[PDB]
Amino acid sequence: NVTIKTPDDIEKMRIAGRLAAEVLEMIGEHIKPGVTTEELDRICHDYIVNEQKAIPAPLNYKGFPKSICTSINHVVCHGIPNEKPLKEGDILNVDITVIKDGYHGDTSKMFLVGKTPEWADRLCQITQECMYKGISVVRPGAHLGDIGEIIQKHAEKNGFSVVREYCGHGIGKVFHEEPQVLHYGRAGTGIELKEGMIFTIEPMINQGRPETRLLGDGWTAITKDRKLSAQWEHTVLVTADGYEILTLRNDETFPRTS
Amino acid sequence: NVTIKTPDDIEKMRIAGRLAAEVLEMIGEHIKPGVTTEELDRICHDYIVNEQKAIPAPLNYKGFPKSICTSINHVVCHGIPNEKPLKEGDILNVDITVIKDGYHGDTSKMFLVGKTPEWADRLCQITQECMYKGISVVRPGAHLGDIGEIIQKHAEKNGFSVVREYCGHGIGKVFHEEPQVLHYGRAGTGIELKEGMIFTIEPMINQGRPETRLLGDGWTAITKDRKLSAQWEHTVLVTADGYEILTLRNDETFPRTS
Amino acid sequence: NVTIKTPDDIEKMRIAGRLAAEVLEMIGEHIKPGVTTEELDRICHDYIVNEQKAIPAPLNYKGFPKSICTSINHVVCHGIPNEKPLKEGDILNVDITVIKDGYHGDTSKMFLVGKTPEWADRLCQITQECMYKGISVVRPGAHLGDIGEIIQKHAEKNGFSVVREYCGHGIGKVFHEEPQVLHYGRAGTGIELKEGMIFTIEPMINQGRPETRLLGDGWTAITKDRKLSAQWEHTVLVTADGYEILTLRNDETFPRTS
Amino acid sequence: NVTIKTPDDIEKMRIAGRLAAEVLEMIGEHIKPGVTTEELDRICHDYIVNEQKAIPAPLNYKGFPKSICTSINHVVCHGIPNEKPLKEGDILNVDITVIKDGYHGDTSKMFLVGKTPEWADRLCQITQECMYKGISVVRPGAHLGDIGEIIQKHAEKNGFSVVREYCGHGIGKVFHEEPQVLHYGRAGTGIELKEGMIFTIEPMINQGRPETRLLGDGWTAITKDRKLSAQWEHTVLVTADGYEILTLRNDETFPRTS
Ligand SMILES: [Mn+2]
Ligand SMILES: [Mn+2]
Ligand SMILES: [Mn+2]
Ligand SMILES: [Mn+2]
Ligand SMILES: [Mn+2]
Ligand SMILES: [Mn+2]
Ligand SMILES: [Mn+2]
Ligand SMILES: [Mn+2]
Ligand SMILES: [Mn+2]
Ligand SMILES: [Mn+2]
Ligand SMILES: [Mn+2]
Ligand SMILES: [Mn+2]
Ligand SMILES: [Mn+2]
Ligand SMILES: [Mn+2]
């Protein structure tokens, strides 16, 4: 079973989505060479807890030890904030999930630290475009495989591959619910969407091969071939006749709704 | 098979669309109780031929006897201008198509004649929204049934029904061409939209039931239940990033392109 | 693969279906206690061949020796018209298929012969209802298992069983093509329905248990428990919108389309 | 406008009328269950051509492919003789027109094939009575309407209906001339009868509703409700005193003249 949110649920999911988005709008100005990922963690934690009157969902979730994930360069996802400083040339994913009165909002973005290689800007830009294209096919009657196909085409046309062993997910009063949202596949397949469903689209897109590999800490996934990997995430509501992005930021120019 | 207009074709279509739009903006000022529909036909005729240096496409088209269509209240489409005066409380569709140097521009709008009942107003408002929604899903890679579903869902959800046996149409150097644009249907179905296609979105939406009957004159369609019917129409080009409304008027707030 | 009928095909399937419906409307007036099924076969054959200028598809089809099927009481399907007279109390299915210019129309109905017992009437009523419900979910993007599921649940919730080893079928210029249309199963399974597909929905529903067995003659299927079995069949087109019952009789009050 | 026949025309119309009568007197012997309408056709053709030295007027007349019309049961008129055997219980109309030296005689009667139901014998009788009453109001100064009214009043008192789409006709050296003789209407309407006019009275009376439909062959008209229809016809001269029935048979008791 996949849950269908009620209009009061939906109203609380917007509040949580907007706060998650705000963490990312806030954090931007602290992102520069020499800031450590655990300093970023601490800043986002304090903001969420003290200013938004909310809770960071990753903290202690299945043992995860921090409030945010910070994934740099060849790391695909789930990087643990630590004492390493950011370096000129790094690309950085900051993945935020906020819980507000029980409702979750989940989003992430890429940051380019200083002078980055040019393959890297474009990897980040195309990955963001993939997410947006997945979002744009969302409507009642669409199938989950439409999201995957349109993401996969756009990645592969640009010489990149789609990560297969991590995916998006339903979200609500629970952080991870059904369905699993694959970022590759075949249009018209998988389950059919319905108004009131909420789920994330969070493609991870690699510069080389798609395979990944888990590090010692059991969290941090990296690209097997050690090339770069980028991710962007939004929380998406299926509306009556399209989509609403619950986690849209004010820097973004993509439409909040269809 | 569906033509693909060239850059020069498109510019000529842009000119024809603007001209068709200007007929509607011009005629608005002559619409009031007491004026006859044949008088409005005359005024549109002379504006088209003598001022625009264009041709009224409907005139003698498969025997049609006038230069415009004028549909009042329960008449669904293709009403024939005549000696009957417009009455306080009527709703009037004026449907225009202009040929300029061989290129067609097709558009219609509703006019409220003097003081109108609120159920009439609501009909005209929902039909316009249906049309705008239909236009908003237009981009390369959309399908035709996306237009049909969004229109039908919006109408039916608000208590109205969609006319089934009349539809929009490809348009260019010919008045009526492939494809048929159904105002009902299921998204993802039908042909796939490509840049440079041009067709009309022209939903006819009824107050009660969808059924129509053709009167003796072989032209004038009415609602079978004799309840009200409204229509709005625009000529639409698929662009690289979405849509351009070639028949947009000055009095509209809905945007020209994506 | 499943054939998609062109619009011309469809117009010809509409003709064939009206003709098949008309046989059923005609033959109703000859059904009463005392008349043999042979005589009804003869009357149906004559009407089809001499008045409709059409052909009865069952005649000689895989050896079948008559023009219509006549299935009485515990007979589930494919009964052979014979010299036995109908008796008061009987329920009778007449299953017609007409070929008009190569195109097929397939439909059946239950007749109550004279005074029938109440449980026989209830069986016939629930079978018709099941057929209508099966038809009601037909539209583009539906799945074949949706038809099955809704028939099965209505039958079973009302105390009856669904016959499993006979099913509906694609039909057009051939009598029996893909897909197989099972009258039991699960929503969302099976092939997706598309505009232009045509197939029968013809559930056989039993008073008691679902199992059948085939008599010596190679054709006549009966209930294993010798209780009553009913069937109703229509030919159904998938339209842009939903469904169109090509075999609708003017005695029916269920809507021709959705 | 209508022609007046000369005394000499008249004497040649008597000859043709008598010969048409004699075809009907001859053919009764051969009417029994199992004989085909085409054999009756063939027998009539040969008698007319070889024994009467005349011509069967229906042959190749506007494409009609036989020498006589044979209408059975729910066939209203213009049945084409074919391979189908007459069946006991059938009512048959045999309609004859003989051309003798350029002059036409046109008449038909009902036959009962073997044992026949009571309702049917009665339709045939009442229809005969309607014709005779129709004949009985014929004199100079009578109006055509008189003929229609009195046939219609008798039909309707008996629960039967008059066919409106076919009618009697002037007849002479041409098969069909002015006027149209309607078998329904209001007394004192229509043109005024004058001595020397010759026309047919040929009422088709249906057991149920009046409406007809045409079978695919473009000739064979049946009752739309499929109920019985009967017809009888004579060719009638207007005289000094009243009427003369040119096609009276020797088995008939009604007076030849007024
Ligand atoms: Mn996340
Ligand atoms: Mn997530
Ligand atoms: Mn990375
Ligand atoms: Mn109207
Ligand atoms: Mn128009
Ligand atoms: Mn496509
Ligand atoms: Mn148009
Ligand atoms: Mn069948
Ligand atoms: Mn599906
Ligand atoms: Mn069948
Ligand atoms: Mn049975
Ligand atoms: Mn008859
Ligand atoms: Mn005749
Ligand atoms: Mn005649």
TrEMBL record, chains A, B, C, D:
Binds 2 divalent metal cations per subunit. Has a high-affinity and a low affinity metal-binding site. The true nature of the physiological cofactor is under debate. The enzyme is active with cobalt, zinc, manganese or divalent iron ions. Most likely, methionine aminopeptidases function as mononuclear Fe(2+)-metalloproteases under physiological conditions, and the catalytically relevant metal-binding site has been assigned to the histidine-containing high-affinity site. Keywords: Aminopeptidase, Hydrolase, Metal-binding, Protease. One of its GO terms (cellular component) is cytosol. Transmembrane segments: none annotated. Its cofactor is Co(2+); Zn(2+); Mn(2+); Fe(2+). The keyword Phosphoprotein does not apply. It catalyses: Release of N-terminal amino acids, preferentially methionine, from peptides and arylamides. Mn(2+) 3 binds at D106, H169, E202, E233. It comes from the Bacteria. Signal peptide: none annotated. A divalent metal cation 2 binds at D106, H169, E202, E233. Its EC number is 3.4.11.18. Mn(2+) 5 binds at H143, E192. Pfam families: Peptidase_M24 (PF00557). Removes the N-terminal methionine from nascent proteins. The N-terminal methionine is often cleaved when the second residue in the primary sequence is small and uncharged (Met-Ala-, Cys, Gly, Pro, Ser, Thr, or Val). Requires deformylation of the N(alpha)-formylated initiator methionine before it can be hydrolyzed. This is Methionine aminopeptidase. It comes from Pseudomonas aeruginosa (strain ATCC 15692 / DSM 22644 / CIP 104116 / JCM 14847 / LMG 12228 / 1C / PRS 101 / PAO1). The lineage of its organism: Bacteria, Pseudomonadati, Pseudomonadota, Gammaproteobacteria, Pseudomonadales.
